[PDB]
Amino acid sequence: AAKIRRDDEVIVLTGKDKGKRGKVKNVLSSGKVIVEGINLVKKHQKPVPALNQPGGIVEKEAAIQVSNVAIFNAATGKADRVGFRFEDGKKVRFFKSNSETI
Amino acid sequence: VLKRNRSHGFRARMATKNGRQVLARRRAKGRARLTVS
RNA sequence: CUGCGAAGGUGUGCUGUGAGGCAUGCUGGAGGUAUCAGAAGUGCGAAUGCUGACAUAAGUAACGAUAAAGCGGGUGAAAAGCCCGCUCGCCGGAAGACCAAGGGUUCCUGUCCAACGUUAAUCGGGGCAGGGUGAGUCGACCCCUAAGGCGAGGCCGAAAGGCGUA
RNA sequence: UGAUAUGAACCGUUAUAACCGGCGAUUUCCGAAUGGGGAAACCCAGUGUGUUUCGACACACUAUCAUUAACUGAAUCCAUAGGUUAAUGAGGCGAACCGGGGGAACUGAAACAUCUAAGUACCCCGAGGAAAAGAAAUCAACCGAGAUUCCCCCAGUAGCGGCGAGCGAACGGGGAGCAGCCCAGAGCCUGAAUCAGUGUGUGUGUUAGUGGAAGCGUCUGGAAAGGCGCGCGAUACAGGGUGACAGCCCCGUACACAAAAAUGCACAUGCUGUGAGCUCGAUGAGUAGGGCGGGAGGUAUCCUGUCUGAAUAUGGGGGGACCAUCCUCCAAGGCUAAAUACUCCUGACUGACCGAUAGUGAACCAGUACCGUGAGGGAAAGGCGAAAAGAACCCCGGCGAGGGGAGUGAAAAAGAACCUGAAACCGUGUACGUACAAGCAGUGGGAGCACGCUUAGGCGUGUGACUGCGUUAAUGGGUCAGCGACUUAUAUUCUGUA
Numbered sequence: 001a002a003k004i005r006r007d008d009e010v011i012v013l014t015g016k017d018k019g020k021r022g023k024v025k026n027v028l029s030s031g032k033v034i035v036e037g038i039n040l041v042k043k044h045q046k047p048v049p050a051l052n053q054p055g056g057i058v059e060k061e062a063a064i065q066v067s068n069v070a071i072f073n074a075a076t077g078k079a080d081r082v083g084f085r086f087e088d089g090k091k092v093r094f095f096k097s098n099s100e101t102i
Numbered sequence: 103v104l105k106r107n108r109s110h111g112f113r114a115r116m117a118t119k120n121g122r123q124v125l126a127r128r129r130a131k132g133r134a135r136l137t138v139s
Numbered sequence: 140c141u142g143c144g145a146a147g148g149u150g151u152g153c154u155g156u157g158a159g160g161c162a163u164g165c166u167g168g169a170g171g172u173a174u175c176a177g178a179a180g181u182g183c184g185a186a187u188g189c190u191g192a193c194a195u196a197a198g199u200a201a202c203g204a205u206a207a208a209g210c211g212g213g214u215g216a217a218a219a220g221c222c223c224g225c226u227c228g229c230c231g232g233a234a235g236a237c238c239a240a241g242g243g244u245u246c247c248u249g250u251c252c253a254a255c256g257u258u259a260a261u262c263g264g265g266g267c268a269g270g271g272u273g274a275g276u277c278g279a280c281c282c283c284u285a286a287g288g289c290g291a292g293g294c295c296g297a298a299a300g301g302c303g304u305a
Numbered sequence: 306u307g308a309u310a311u312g313a314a315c316c317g318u319u320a321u322a323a324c325c326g327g328c329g330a331u332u333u334c335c336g337a338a339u340g341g342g343g344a345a346a347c348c349c350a351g352u353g354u355g356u357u358u359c360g361a362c363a364c365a366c367u368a369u370c371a372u373u374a375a376c377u378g379a380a381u382c383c384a385u386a387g388g389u390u391a392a393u394g395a396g397g398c399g400a401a402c403c404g405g406g407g408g409a410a411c412u413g414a415a416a417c418a419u420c421u422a423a424g425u426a427c428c429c430c431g432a433g434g435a436a437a438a439g440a441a442a443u444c445a446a447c448c449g450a451g452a453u454u455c456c457c458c459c460a461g462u463a464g465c466g467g468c469g470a471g472c473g474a475a476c477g478g479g480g481a482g483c484a485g486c487c488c489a490g491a492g493c494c495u496g497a498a499u500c501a502g503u504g505u506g507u508g509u510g511u512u513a514g515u516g517g518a519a520g521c522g523u524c525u526g527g528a529a530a531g532g533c534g535c536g537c538g539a540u541a542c543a544g545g546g547u548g549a550c551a552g553c554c555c556c557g558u559a560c561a562c563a564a565a566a567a568u569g570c571a572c573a574u575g576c577u578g579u580g581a582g583c584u585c586g587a588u589g590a591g592u593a594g595g596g597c598g599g600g601a602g603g604u605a606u607c608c609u610g611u612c613u614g615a616a617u618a619u620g621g622g623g624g625g626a627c628c629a630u631c632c633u634c635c636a637a638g639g640c641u642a643a644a645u646a647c648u649c650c651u652g653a654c655u656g657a658c659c660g661a662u663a664g665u666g667a668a669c670c671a672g673u674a675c676c677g678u679g680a681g682g683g684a685a686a687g688g689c690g691a692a693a694a695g696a697a698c699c700c701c702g703g704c705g706a707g708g709g710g711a712g713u714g715a716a717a718a719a720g721a722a723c724c725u726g727a728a729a730c731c732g733u734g735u736a737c738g739u740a741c742a743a744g745c746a747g748u749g750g751g752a753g754c755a756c757g758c759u760u761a762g763g764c765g766u767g768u769g770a771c772u773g774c775g776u777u778a779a780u781g782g783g784u785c786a787g788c789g790a791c792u793u794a795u796a797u798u799c800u801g802u803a
Contacts, residue, residue: 001515003555006318013554015691016528031547031556032692042713043694055697057712062692067547067555079554084516090319091515107344110679112336116345119429124680125336126398132672136336138679139345 003071003082003093004033010069011079012038021072025061032063039064071095112137 004010004024010033012018022035039062047055070079073095080095093102108114115121115137128136 014529015548018528039692041692041694044696044713045694047697057697058694060694062694064692065547065555070554078521081519081554083518086516096518104344106678112345113343116336122397127680130399134672137345 001084001091002027004066004069009072009074010035011072012064012069013079014068015039015064024069027066028063031066033066033069034061034063035069036061073097075100106138110138112139 004027006024006026008024009021010024011021012035017038020038022038025034025036027033040059041062043058043060045054045056045058047053071082071093073080076097080097082093082095083099084091085094086092087101094100095102112125115125125136
């Protein structure tokens, strides 16, 4: 019963990048999600003599709180809450404000 | 080692009731080393 | 009241006889406070009060053969004693070596190493990690026997036990 | 695919992932350890059956004590004891409270030791899930009351003690509780009710949960939950996490709902078993009294070693004894719900108790490090950031540590001894005073000089030559910070107020 899932179109509600849309890549058990292209962090990658020698500065994605993002409605062009309803015995997600199935 | 075990070992403690009480008190306190061995 | 910057801390200024409070700058960056009341683990200079906090004393063990030392080279922050090359002096029917008994990871490879209030060690057996003990005819254990020891009866002794056969 | 702890190799996507709950299989060595022994995590077992390999392989049973059954059976004919086999049960560990069997000191007194402390601390055995007790040989001297325990009055009373300190009642009244039976042994009449055990079905509840409405935007700011203007909802503003203090970004609460299996609390039904009315006996068939010894002491009441023998609703016993007046009361087998007691473990709720020298010993890999033969007592140590991408490259140095740049972040007076960083102590830089200095390192008056103000006004701050007034090396200590030193409860008395 998680509102945010593996493949979801979400929009940032708060933070330095509020309002930019994106797709969630994965969700952490600590109530955090990773969405590509918004929370860029410049990590100084220490060089290693192993098979991989990227070194330099890497542009990674930093996880953000689940509550900081909402599913994009994609029809009203604004963030909307999502709830659960039982249909033919299968639990599904649905928007609000003219709620329609995903 | 021999005298230590025969004086404060597990078998020595359990032989008499008072030693049995000593083991009971150690267990209640939850000591890692119940006895010497 | 409150990010044009809280409380605490460090300065200055004002007020009251005294305990203090209000208004700020700097530091700090997350909640704080007055009036009318109530509830007490509430304020510190000593009880040989308690735990760290200016201090007069620095982590590495073998000084007990009258056979003999010195020179060179390599390593090292250190060289009369270790390793390599050139000599001399003892032992050499053993001061060699291989077995029994006794002893039971000490013998084989890389390492805690720029050192407190001025600690200046000639030994690569130390504490903490990795390997080797390989078997028909090496040996013991397995089979039979004496002494010693033990052991259902009988023999010695009123029983038992001891002696003693299998 | 536990955490410390990144990555890689795998599994899952229109119903066998993981996680949680319930029902099973499996559960070695050591520890009550059951075959024995010893120095607890060490070695060694026996018998029977199957084993493709006739040098094997695997598993069960077997201790002691008590009960029951079977076989054998003395000494001393039979009986009985002992021994063998099978089944069942008992044994150990961990709070508090209660019961049974035993039993101290200190603290108290002007020394008649007893009385108090004390039927206490501690120690031993067993049972229950509350235990003990629990339906009168009892109170009331003839109004009445009717089981036990605990709490609140009578009551710091009446009594008791070298009448000294101390210890410490009944009856009556007002509440919760307010449901009692069987055996001393029977004649007659029965699928006659209820209660128990073993099953099914219905309703409810416990052990994983689902559904679940509701604030957009702007200013300061790197980032917004708060401010200003404007709404909805309120059965829901209960709490916590959520970049700065969040009802309405989320996870949740109230309301409405769920059960494959197991378990618990009420009924009905089927099977088995225990069981009502109408009457007739008895009132524990070796159970007293008396005699002897000890404790609660010449002694009322209670319990018993040995040796005799009559009763008990007909009749036998008590505090103001009198035809052992009258009324009440029935004395040596168990069981007995609940009220009253207790919190080592779970979930929810509560908080003017506590916030890292506090609180439990431990907010934490602390029942630790360390000390000891053993028992026992028992440390220090909390906080970087929203995200640890944690440090590319370059310089000095030893291919370290430490320090100086760049880059990332709002901030590097956040850079692995890392939030805010005090008192005291140890350095650098500037100004002033003292350079054969010592008399409590203060106070009053006052000169010169430096650094800030005032167009001249003997008033900043800091330094204080000289002069006047001026000692515990008879107590502890090198300095400073933090914690702690007249509290809480039960009576009486006094003051003030409502």
